[PDB]
Amino acid sequence: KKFLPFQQFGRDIADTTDAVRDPQTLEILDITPCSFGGVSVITPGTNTSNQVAVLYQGVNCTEVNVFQTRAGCLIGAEHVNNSYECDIPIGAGICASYQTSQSIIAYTMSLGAENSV
Amino acid sequence: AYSNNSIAIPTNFTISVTTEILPVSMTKTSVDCTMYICGDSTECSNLLLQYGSFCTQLNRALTGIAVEQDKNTQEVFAQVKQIYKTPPIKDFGGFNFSQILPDPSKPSKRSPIEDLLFNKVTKFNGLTVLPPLLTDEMIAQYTSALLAGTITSGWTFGAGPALQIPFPMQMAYRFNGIGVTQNVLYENQKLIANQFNSAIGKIQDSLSSTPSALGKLQDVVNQNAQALNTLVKQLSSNFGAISSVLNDILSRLDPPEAEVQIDRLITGRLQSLQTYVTQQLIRAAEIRASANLAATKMSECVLGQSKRVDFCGKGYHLMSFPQSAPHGVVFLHVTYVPAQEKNFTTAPAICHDGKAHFPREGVFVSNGTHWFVTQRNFYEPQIITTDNTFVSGNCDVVIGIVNNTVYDPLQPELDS
Amino acid sequence: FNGLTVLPPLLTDEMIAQYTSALLAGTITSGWTFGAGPALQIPFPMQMAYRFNGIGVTQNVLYENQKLIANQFNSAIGKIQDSLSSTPSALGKLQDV
Amino acid sequence: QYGSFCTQLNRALTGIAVEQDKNTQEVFAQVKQIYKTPPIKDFGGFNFS
Amino acid sequence: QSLQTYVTQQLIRAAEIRASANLAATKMSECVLGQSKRVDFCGKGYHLM
Amino acid sequence: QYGSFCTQLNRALTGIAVEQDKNTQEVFAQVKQIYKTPPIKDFGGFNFS
Ligand SMILES: *[C@@H]1O[C@H](CO)[C@@H](O[C@@H]2O[C@H](CO)[C@@H](O)[C@H](O)[C@H]2NC(C)=O)[C@H](O)[C@H]1NC(C)=O
Ligand SMILES: *[C@@H]1O[C@H](CO)[C@@H](O[C@@H]2O[C@H](CO)[C@@H](O)[C@H](O)[C@H]2NC(C)=O)[C@H](O)[C@H]1NC(C)=O
Ligand SMILES: *[C@@H]1O[C@H](CO)[C@@H](O[C@@H]2O[C@H](CO)[C@@H](O)[C@H](O)[C@H]2NC(C)=O)[C@H](O)[C@H]1NC(C)=O
Ligand SMILES: *[C@@H]1O[C@H](CO)[C@@H](O[C@@H]2O[C@H](CO)[C@@H](O)[C@H](O)[C@H]2NC(C)=O)[C@H](O)[C@H]1NC(C)=O
Ligand SMILES: *[C@@H]1O[C@H](CO)[C@@H](O[C@@H]2O[C@H](CO)[C@@H](O)[C@H](O)[C@H]2NC(C)=O)[C@H](O)[C@H]1NC(C)=O
Ligand SMILES: *[C@@H]1O[C@H](CO)[C@@H](O[C@@H]2O[C@H](CO)[C@@H](O)[C@H](O)[C@H]2NC(C)=O)[C@H](O)[C@H]1NC(C)=O
Ligand SMILES: *[C@@H]1O[C@H](CO)[C@@H](O)[C@H](O)[C@H]1NC(C)=O
Ligand SMILES: *[C@@H]1O[C@H](CO)[C@@H](O)[C@H](O)[C@H]1NC(C)=O
Ligand SMILES: *[C@@H]1O[C@H](CO)[C@@H](O)[C@H](O)[C@H]1NC(C)=O
Ligand SMILES: *[C@@H]1O[C@H](CO)[C@@H](O)[C@H](O)[C@H]1NC(C)=O
Ligand SMILES: *[C@@H]1O[C@H](CO)[C@@H](O)[C@H](O)[C@H]1NC(C)=O
């Protein structure tokens, strides 16, 4: 960005300040919120297993058996090429389940068996 | 032009395709109550815990909405268990479905109409958005399977297994379901296929031409954006405090009088979230009702042939083809509209041997001098015979009965 | 007068009466044709014959009993006027709103 | 000092008022052709007066 | 706070009236403009008009 | 000193409670007369027991 010389701050569509001018060096620096997000715990019923997988919503896998998804960074669940019926929804087409030896797996959910008329 | 002896019967018809747009899901917005009110402030959080489960209840209500939005999409679109596909053969009796069928020569395989629908619709202080469980590509597959089943199997894929049927023969059922005889189709198949193809082309222009057609889907996006924009702007309000910035109160005031000013911000910001969550719950109820209606329509108009008037477009419903849309679903309703009509003189029964003759199907009509019997929804005059009419009562009871002659097809067979 | 105002409805009472009258005229003179397409005139007892066959009763029952059916219909409408103008609780749903 | 707390209440009630006129139109304005009955009310003995 | 309580009640009550308006529009489309075969949708008995 | 705020909350919950009893009346009390099956269970082989 090229701020006008009098302008010392940058403003968002709302009220957040996105850009600023460093006082000593006249270079322009844009600000960004320190990352944050929810930590959902993906678990089967505790009467079956106490093993869990943790999903960090809307974050990369660097700030936090690691599977990066659009819904966030999934840790503890194995990525499986095979599709299945959705059991525990995660988001963006990914669901998790506890399957056989047994472990928590993550996969793109199947929409049903393909057929042709 | 009402009178006691005049009936109007259509002699021609047109194929009309109408577009019905319904919202299905909202944006899965999730708000962190603690970060919104007391971001990066341990002291403010210690004051928030004095309100008990206010924050937790607000997070729970928004979570319930987000789960519901995935439920709304599931019921509307996942009404088929098997993913059906159309064959490479496109011989459907002259009916051109290429503008509603997925286009494989492009990313994110979609129909030309579906792409037009998507192209006409437009994480900060504790606010994030969650992705839907079913992506646009997955919804396109659901609509493709529903579309393929409708074209190749009629309504059989919904009630049970997909039973293949020639599409012209499928349309013959669709004629017979609205009271028009099968032969009207086969005699006019080229006209009907051409009218259907032209109507689909008009849909592509109509939606494109007027940019306010998809306003029902854009309204949902606009209202949700306004709710979040209002929510963020409330952070700049003082609510009676010295400063809307917490750090400009703590570092300008001793805690004993700094807690009096901060207690005016937590109350203001917590109340702002409650207003936001309440509005989202009320709006989610409206979207849920729309999603339930959309699921009902696809079940009864895409997976079958509804007989409900004006449920799936003006005219007499035949069949609908679902199309994917952002945050909603679009139905293309194909109906029969009678177009060209003539004035005919009519009668409720006819007197032949003193016995009253009534039409088994259709109505008696006279072309000035000759009397015939034709189907009520399409003019097609037939000679009045004993195989077209039934006997009940006599001519001294029926009001308005007229004299004519029934041809008996068995008399010349016996005479010859 | 505390900042509270009421806005008039866009359609007045006489305008809603026109809409109902148009719907009433179409139903009586054209059956269901004015809704699906153009208003196709049909004699009313012929229209009732179609209404007969829609419920599984052969239309000859109408023409043989047309005088009875018309009389019973006319009496039933008259009962509506008496019932509505006698019971002080029939229109509770509109009054409750 | 309360920001949009007042304004958004005016907007919410305005939305209802527009919806109320919408509700009437979907119910009654389902014809778009003002039909009239014939001057001679002769409908096979059925009295619609 | 009084206005927010009042507006919230109006929003909830408007949803109930809107549902009734949608039902009324559905009935006039199906009970008036056609001949509904849905049991008890257009009153007790076999619907005629 | 808060006026009717207490009374309105009681009224809203009372309206909900009445609505719940109405909810059961429309769903289940759709038949005027109490029908009973005869001691004969000969329904053509269909076991409804
Ligand atoms: C029903 O109307 C259609 C028009 O909508 C007729 O089809 C047209 O016929 C004319 C000849 O008179 C042609 O010039 C047009 O090209 C036709 N249009 C289309 C789309 O095919 C049709 O012939 C009429 N049918 C009957 C039985 O009268
Ligand atoms: C269905 O209609 C489309 C047009 O809507 C036909 O595609 C056209 O084909 C012609 C001749 O090949 C091309 O010149 C046009 O550019 C095409 N138009 C478009 C928009 O694609 C298509 O062939 C028809 N389907 C069949 C099987 O006939
Ligand atoms: C009513 O229809 C009948 C049958 O189509 C017409 O009678 C025919 O008229 C043609 C001349 O256009 C003759 O070639 C046929 O021999 C006639 N058939 C019979 C059985 O008479 C009659 O002309 C039509 N009348 C009107 C007023 O349209
Ligand atoms: C229809 O035809 C019947 C007879 O086929 C007509 O009945 C006759 O009515 C006239 C006048 O009332 C009498 O003169 C005859 O004696 C009746 N016929 C018999 C068998 O007795 C009847 O009038 C005809 N309808 C019309 C309006 O012409
Ligand atoms: C339809 O019924 C109304 C009554 O429901 C009839 O109106 C009556 O008209 C006579 C004059 O012939 C008056 O003496 C009565 O007072 C009227 N009654 C009312 C309540 O208005 C009317 O005659 C009937 N219409 C037809 C065409 O028969
Ligand atoms: C209806 O089916 C029930 C079972 O579903 C039958 O009840 C059985 O009766 C036999 C006696 O012949 C018992 O030994 C079984 O234990 C019963 N089962 C149960 C679950 O009750 C009943 O007989 C059938 N009704 C008729 C009239 O045949
Ligand atoms: C679940 O675990 C409980 C132990 O508390 C056990 O009694 C029950 O049978 C289990 N059910 C299943 C379906 O595994
Ligand atoms: C952040 O995630 C994206 C995937 O959307 C990935 O390409 C990128 O490498 C990630 N950032 C880092 C620093 O790894
Ligand atoms: C899926 O299979 C491909 C080989 O086609 C392989 O490269 C990839 O690692 C597999 N992914 C998973 C999650 O097993
Ligand atoms: C039928 O006759 C009326 C006159 O009563 C006229 O207005 C109408 O246009 C005619 N309909 C046709 C299809 O000719
Ligand atoms: C039809 O109306 C005319 C008046 O125009 C009348 O003369 C005739 O008797 C009526 N016919 C019937 C069957 O009602």
mmCIF file of N, CA and C in Angstrom, chain A residues 51-106:
data_model
loop_
_atom_site.group_PDB
_atom_site.id
_atom_site.type_symbol
_atom_site.label_atom_id
_atom_site.label_comp_id
_atom_site.label_asym_id
_atom_site.label_seq_id
_atom_site.Cartn_x
_atom_site.Cartn_y
_atom_site.Cartn_z
ATOM 1 N N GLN A 51 -9.760 -42.695 23.179
ATOM 2 C CA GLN A 51 -8.903 -42.019 22.219
ATOM 3 C C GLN A 51 -9.676 -40.913 21.515
ATOM 4 N N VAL A 52 -9.039 -39.750 21.372
ATOM 5 C CA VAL A 52 -9.683 -38.578 20.801
ATOM 6 C C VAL A 52 -8.769 -37.955 19.753
ATOM 7 N N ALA A 53 -9.382 -37.180 18.863
ATOM 8 C CA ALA A 53 -8.673 -36.351 17.902
ATOM 9 C C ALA A 53 -9.104 -34.904 18.088
ATOM 10 N N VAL A 54 -8.165 -33.984 17.890
ATOM 11 C CA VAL A 54 -8.372 -32.572 18.185
ATOM 12 C C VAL A 54 -8.355 -31.790 16.881
ATOM 13 N N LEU A 55 -9.398 -30.994 16.658
ATOM 14 C CA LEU A 55 -9.503 -30.137 15.486
ATOM 15 C C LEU A 55 -9.357 -28.682 15.916
ATOM 16 N N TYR A 56 -8.402 -27.980 15.313
ATOM 17 C CA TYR A 56 -8.182 -26.562 15.568
ATOM 18 C C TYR A 56 -8.828 -25.777 14.432
ATOM 19 N N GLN A 57 -9.926 -25.088 14.733
ATOM 20 C CA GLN A 57 -10.746 -24.488 13.687
ATOM 21 C C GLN A 57 -10.030 -23.319 13.022
ATOM 22 N N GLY A 58 -10.026 -23.323 11.692
ATOM 23 C CA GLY A 58 -9.585 -22.158 10.931
ATOM 24 C C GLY A 58 -8.166 -21.720 11.210
ATOM 25 N N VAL A 59 -7.249 -22.674 11.364
ATOM 26 C CA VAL A 59 -5.845 -22.364 11.584
ATOM 27 C C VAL A 59 -5.000 -23.326 10.758
ATOM 28 N N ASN A 60 -3.757 -22.925 10.508
ATOM 29 C CA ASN A 60 -2.813 -23.773 9.801
ATOM 30 C C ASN A 60 -2.237 -24.810 10.764
ATOM 31 N N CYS A 61 -1.381 -25.687 10.243
ATOM 32 C CA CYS A 61 -0.756 -26.726 11.049
ATOM 33 C C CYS A 61 0.648 -26.343 11.504
ATOM 34 N N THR A 62 0.993 -25.061 11.430
ATOM 35 C CA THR A 62 2.278 -24.558 11.898
ATOM 36 C C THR A 62 2.180 -23.787 13.203
ATOM 37 N N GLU A 63 1.120 -22.995 13.384
ATOM 38 C CA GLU A 63 0.945 -22.265 14.635
ATOM 39 C C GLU A 63 0.660 -23.212 15.795
ATOM 40 N N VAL A 64 -0.079 -24.287 15.541
ATOM 41 C CA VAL A 64 -0.406 -25.252 16.582
ATOM 42 C C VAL A 64 0.838 -26.030 16.995
ATOM 43 N N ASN A 65 0.980 -37.715 11.966
ATOM 44 C CA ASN A 65 -0.461 -37.938 11.965
ATOM 45 C C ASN A 65 -1.217 -36.616 12.048
ATOM 46 N N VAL A 66 -0.912 -35.707 11.127
ATOM 47 C CA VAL A 66 -1.542 -34.395 11.063
ATOM 48 C C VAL A 66 -2.188 -34.242 9.693
ATOM 49 N N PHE A 67 -3.474 -33.902 9.681
ATOM 50 C CA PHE A 67 -4.250 -33.766 8.451
ATOM 51 C C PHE A 67 -4.787 -32.342 8.387
ATOM 52 N N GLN A 68 -4.322 -31.575 7.406
ATOM 53 C CA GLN A 68 -4.785 -30.207 7.202
ATOM 54 C C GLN A 68 -6.050 -30.224 6.354
ATOM 55 N N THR A 69 -7.120 -29.637 6.879
ATOM 56 C CA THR A 69 -8.402 -29.554 6.197
ATOM 57 C C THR A 69 -8.828 -28.095 6.090
ATOM 58 N N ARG A 70 -9.834 -27.848 5.247
ATOM 59 C CA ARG A 70 -10.378 -26.499 5.134
ATOM 60 C C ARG A 70 -11.005 -26.042 6.445
ATOM 61 N N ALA A 71 -11.578 -26.970 7.213
ATOM 62 C CA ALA A 71 -12.164 -26.615 8.499
ATOM 63 C C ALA A 71 -11.109 -26.291 9.547
ATOM 64 N N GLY A 72 -9.869 -26.697 9.329
ATOM 65 C CA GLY A 72 -8.800 -26.411 10.259
ATOM 66 C C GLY A 72 -7.764 -27.516 10.231
ATOM 67 N N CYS A 73 -6.885 -27.483 11.227
ATOM 68 C CA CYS A 73 -5.806 -28.453 11.359
ATOM 69 C C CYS A 73 -6.261 -29.583 12.273
ATOM 70 N N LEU A 74 -6.298 -30.798 11.735
ATOM 71 C CA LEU A 74 -6.752 -31.973 12.468
ATOM 72 C C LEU A 74 -5.543 -32.786 12.914
ATOM 73 N N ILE A 75 -5.457 -33.048 14.216
ATOM 74 C CA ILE A 75 -4.332 -33.755 14.816
ATOM 75 C C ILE A 75 -4.865 -34.984 15.540
ATOM 76 N N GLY A 76 -4.244 -36.136 15.285
ATOM 77 C CA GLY A 76 -4.596 -37.381 15.934
ATOM 78 C C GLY A 76 -5.417 -38.325 15.084
ATOM 79 N N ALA A 77 -6.015 -37.840 14.001
ATOM 80 C CA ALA A 77 -6.818 -38.678 13.124
ATOM 81 C C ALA A 77 -6.058 -38.986 11.840
ATOM 82 N N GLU A 78 -6.099 -40.250 11.431
ATOM 83 C CA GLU A 78 -5.396 -40.683 10.234
ATOM 84 C C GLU A 78 -6.195 -40.348 8.980
ATOM 85 N N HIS A 79 -5.479 -39.922 7.942
ATOM 86 C CA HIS A 79 -6.085 -39.603 6.656
ATOM 87 C C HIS A 79 -6.204 -40.881 5.835
ATOM 88 N N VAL A 80 -7.423 -41.200 5.409
ATOM 89 C CA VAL A 80 -7.719 -42.434 4.690
ATOM 90 C C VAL A 80 -8.245 -42.080 3.306
ATOM 91 N N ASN A 81 -7.697 -42.738 2.281
ATOM 92 C CA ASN A 81 -8.144 -42.499 0.912
ATOM 93 C C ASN A 81 -9.571 -42.985 0.688
ATOM 94 N N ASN A 82 -9.989 -44.029 1.399
ATOM 95 C CA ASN A 82 -11.300 -44.628 1.187
ATOM 96 C C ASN A 82 -12.396 -43.757 1.788
ATOM 97 N N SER A 83 -13.510 -43.640 1.073
ATOM 98 C CA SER A 83 -14.661 -42.887 1.543
ATOM 99 C C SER A 83 -15.648 -43.804 2.260
ATOM 100 N N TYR A 84 -16.377 -43.225 3.211
ATOM 101 C CA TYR A 84 -17.371 -43.959 3.982
ATOM 102 C C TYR A 84 -18.554 -43.039 4.252
ATOM 103 N N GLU A 85 -19.590 -43.600 4.870
ATOM 104 C CA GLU A 85 -20.706 -42.790 5.336
ATOM 105 C C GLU A 85 -20.252 -41.901 6.484
ATOM 106 N N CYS A 86 -20.750 -40.668 6.504
ATOM 107 C CA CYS A 86 -20.333 -39.716 7.524
ATOM 108 C C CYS A 86 -20.823 -40.163 8.896
ATOM 109 N N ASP A 87 -19.922 -40.140 9.876
ATOM 110 C CA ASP A 87 -20.260 -40.526 11.240
ATOM 111 C C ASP A 87 -20.168 -39.325 12.171
ATOM 112 N N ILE A 88 -19.006 -38.681 12.203
ATOM 113 C CA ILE A 88 -18.791 -37.469 12.987
ATOM 114 C C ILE A 88 -18.405 -36.357 12.015
ATOM 115 N N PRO A 89 -19.298 -35.420 11.707
ATOM 116 C CA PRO A 89 -18.963 -34.386 10.721
ATOM 117 C C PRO A 89 -17.890 -33.441 11.237
ATOM 118 N N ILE A 90 -16.972 -33.080 10.346
ATOM 119 C CA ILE A 90 -15.924 -32.110 10.630
ATOM 120 C C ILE A 90 -16.151 -30.813 9.862
ATOM 121 N N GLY A 91 -16.386 -30.912 8.566
ATOM 122 C CA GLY A 91 -16.635 -29.760 7.722
ATOM 123 C C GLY A 91 -15.884 -29.881 6.411
ATOM 124 N N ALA A 92 -16.406 -29.197 5.391
ATOM 125 C CA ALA A 92 -15.809 -29.174 4.054
ATOM 126 C C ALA A 92 -15.649 -30.580 3.481
ATOM 127 N N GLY A 93 -16.642 -31.434 3.720
ATOM 128 C CA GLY A 93 -16.654 -32.764 3.152
ATOM 129 C C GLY A 93 -15.893 -33.815 3.928
ATOM 130 N N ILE A 94 -15.316 -33.468 5.074
ATOM 131 C CA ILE A 94 -14.509 -34.389 5.865
ATOM 132 C C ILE A 94 -15.320 -34.853 7.065
ATOM 133 N N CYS A 95 -15.331 -36.162 7.300
ATOM 134 C CA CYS A 95 -15.945 -36.747 8.481
ATOM 135 C C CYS A 95 -14.965 -37.717 9.123
ATOM 136 N N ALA A 96 -15.168 -37.969 10.413
ATOM 137 C CA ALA A 96 -14.285 -38.828 11.185
ATOM 138 C C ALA A 96 -15.084 -39.957 11.817
ATOM 139 N N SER A 97 -14.410 -41.080 12.044
ATOM 140 C CA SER A 97 -15.044 -42.248 12.637
ATOM 141 C C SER A 97 -13.971 -43.104 13.294
ATOM 142 N N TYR A 98 -14.418 -44.009 14.160
ATOM 143 C CA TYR A 98 -13.542 -44.923 14.885
ATOM 144 C C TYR A 98 -13.704 -46.304 14.263
ATOM 145 N N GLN A 99 -12.677 -46.755 13.545
ATOM 146 C CA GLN A 99 -12.765 -47.968 12.747
ATOM 147 C C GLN A 99 -11.490 -48.782 12.923
ATOM 148 N N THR A 100 -11.632 -50.100 12.803
ATOM 149 C CA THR A 100 -10.505 -51.022 12.896
ATOM 150 C C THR A 100 -9.435 -50.711 11.853
ATOM 151 N N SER A 101 -5.612 -52.096 16.879
ATOM 152 C CA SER A 101 -6.139 -52.257 15.528
ATOM 153 C C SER A 101 -7.059 -51.100 15.155
ATOM 154 N N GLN A 102 -7.807 -50.604 16.136
ATOM 155 C CA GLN A 102 -8.755 -49.525 15.913
ATOM 156 C C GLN A 102 -8.105 -48.170 16.168
ATOM 157 N N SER A 103 -8.520 -47.180 15.384
ATOM 158 C CA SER A 103 -8.014 -45.820 15.521
ATOM 159 C C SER A 103 -9.016 -44.866 14.888
ATOM 160 N N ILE A 104 -8.850 -43.583 15.191
ATOM 161 C CA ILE A 104 -9.699 -42.546 14.614
ATOM 162 C C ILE A 104 -9.159 -42.176 13.241
ATOM 163 N N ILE A 105 -10.043 -42.160 12.246
ATOM 164 C CA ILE A 105 -9.659 -41.900 10.867
ATOM 165 C C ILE A 105 -10.455 -40.714 10.342
ATOM 166 N N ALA A 106 -9.891 -40.058 9.330
ATOM 167 C CA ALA A 106 -10.521 -38.924 8.671
ATOM 168 C C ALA A 106 -10.552 -39.178 7.173
#
